[model samples]
Target: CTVQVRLELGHRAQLRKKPTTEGFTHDWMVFVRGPEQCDIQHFVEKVVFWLHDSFPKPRRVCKEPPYKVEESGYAGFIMPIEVHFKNKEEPRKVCFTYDLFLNLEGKVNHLRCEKLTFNNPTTEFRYKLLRAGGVMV
Candidate 1:
């Protein structure tokens, strides 16, 4: 069983305006969560989202969240998300994870997330389409 995910903009409760553009600055955060059922001794593999935010010319890679941005232009995404069992157990049980990326400007912010599903490709596709936001054609 493979887990798929969809990233969405989460919403800010007490924000007034959104971040459109500026110069020499950046702001963002990403939150992560595990499966719904309570279980121990089986930890899923950690996913990494590569990001490029600096201006000069060097990109950065972030493996864990509370991911932050501090530059002018930013680009980030998961190279690929994978799942596994503890010590390579047999029968392959279904397990998943959840993630949320937040872009905050004072009280204003945006939301993005990673979802875990059993058998879904559309979820991933939808994430790409939404992320593109009219840039895809």
Candidate 2:
């Protein structure tokens, strides 16, 4: 049996009138959520966002709902995301990438989605996904 879940990476950025002493020019936030505001905590155990090295504590981990990272920066960078699912098996985590950027015009909001397929899920995990509104295929 297989199940599929739709996840989204959303971000918003605002340009600052004056740059910070650290040279930060924009404030931004990146987050992971289920499409249509669905609750993913039922099947997802946690999420890890690997930010740019210049930021203090680049490795940000979210263990609850609203898996997200907020910060300010001067430039865009590629972000690596790690998602951990509630499963009893090896390779229980999936990885994705997002380009964190700013808008020169005004406040910018961007959202991207991905469908995750769990192939041949164990009976227990399958039920958990189903209960969390996962699609069966």
Candidate 3:
């Protein structure tokens, strides 16, 4: 089942976005998995937002949060809606992963993410007319 996620700013109590003309090179990418109960229509409201101030890996640098501009210009990109298979084991289960490409001014560059293998799904997986996370304009 596919769930629709609403686009809204996630929790910033823990993480802070670095203030820079380039916006911290790129703010930390928040990873979230839709709950078992959530479907595209229902998930929108139940979508979970995540972020971290530090990179757990020793070589990677942790983010500072408040991203100079924490809010994403492409609000719709961080959606909860996703497609998955039911009753399937690891082999049959489809895996999806994506990322958010931002501009220097802390806005979405809107680059065409053509990667078919789902290296970073954030670029292409979004709702132009979504009703998931927030009150649509």
Candidate 4:
């Protein structure tokens, strides 16, 4: 079966550029949609980029929510994001690249996703494209 977006994106996001070492939290509503299997890290990046490109920049950055190694038992992952300055004055491509948490517990979970919503941005996109991953377990 082909996967499809089931929700409407209400906003876009342009996060403040931050360092991953310090860790961060995503203060927005996000929807994850795609295949059944994923690299985990890749899915996170896609969500960030989808939300970032939903509207104009400065794009909201994707941040990691609080996780407990003792509770969730997932270590989590990180991806360096940048607003690549094509020039010095013109607004470069603002982007949010990061993750929420990880499934480092070695236990499998459902990854049915193809759409990620960012209810935060400089301006919201009235409409955007949501990709489909279908069933690819």
Candidate 5:
């Protein structure tokens, strides 16, 4: 047996070349597909592991709703994911975040993974492949 997987970037989650103080920064998001069960903890662990594997020091940046928050926020996870190519001078950065929730009793819960505002020119061309068609997990 097999399961189909799909991942769609949020409305504001497209890549762009932005002006910096002295240079350009590439920005975008990469959303991860969720498990069928949609258990919060299970989904978070998957994202944590993926970040750990993708970068050198994948740190837990902040905590939001569902688990914990300052005043109030939403269920989400944030970390910095790294990208590299043999020809590049440095490993580029990708900001990672995820939100999970059980919306209803019988429905597959909500799961969204995102790479927020990040500036890594090296990753620009590599991830821009999604422009060819819809995305997948």
Candidate 6:
């Protein structure tokens, strides 16, 4: 028995009309959400967004809905995302990498779909997953 959950990694970037003194040229955000706007907090405990070292608080944690990190930057980088689950019997963490970029040519709105699979999940966890829109097979 297995369960699968669909999630999306999304971002929107807008170029600044006038760049900041610190060389920041765009405002952007990276987020994690359930597909079709389903609520995922039933299975997901929290999400940790790891940003560039130069950021004031590079490690951002979101414990509620709308898990995201927003900031301004002149460049792009590969961000590491850590998702923590609520089920104690299952693995606690899942990792994903996202390429965060700023395009000077036009506005950037990117979305990527991700599927998480749980094999032989605990009965209690499977129940929570089903309530959170997980597909069983």
- The whole-model lDDT of each prediction reads 0.33, 0.88, 0.27, 0.27, 0.28, 0.90
TM-score per prediction, in order, is: 0.31, 0.92, 0.24, 0.20, 0.25, 0.95
> Candidate 5 at residue 62, lDDT?
23
The lowest-lDDT stretch of 10 consecutive residues in candidate 2 is: 124-133
- Clash pairs, candidate 2, are none
- What TM-score, to 2 decimals, does candidate 6 have? 0.95
lDDT of 1: 0.33
Q: Ranking under lDDT, best-scoring first? A: 6, 2, 1, 5, 4, 3
Candidate 5: where are CA atoms >4 Å away? 1-91, 109-137
Write model 3 residue lDDT over 1-137, tens digit each, in one string: 13233222222212226544633344434323222332233212222222223423212211222111233222223322122322122221222333443444443422221111212223123331122231222
Candidate closer to the true structure by TM-score (higher is better), 1 or 3: 1
lDDT per residue as tens, model 2, 1-137:
77898888889999988988998889999999987757888888999999989989999999998899989888889999999999988659999988988887668899998888998888888866777778898
What's the lDDT for candidate 3?
Answer: 0.27
Candidate 3 has a TM-score of 0.24
Task: For candidate 5, report its TM-score.
Answer: 0.25
lDDT by residue (60-96, candidate 4, tens digit) is 4433311111111113333323322212222323344
For 41-72, candidate 6 gives per-residue lDDT tens digits of 98999999999999998999999988998899
Q: Who wins the TM-score comparison?
A: 6
Question: Number of the top candidate by lDDT?
Answer: 6
Candidate 3 differs from the real structure by a C-alpha RMSD in angstroms, to one decimal, of: 12.9
Q: Which scores greater on TM-score, model 3 or model 4?
A: 3
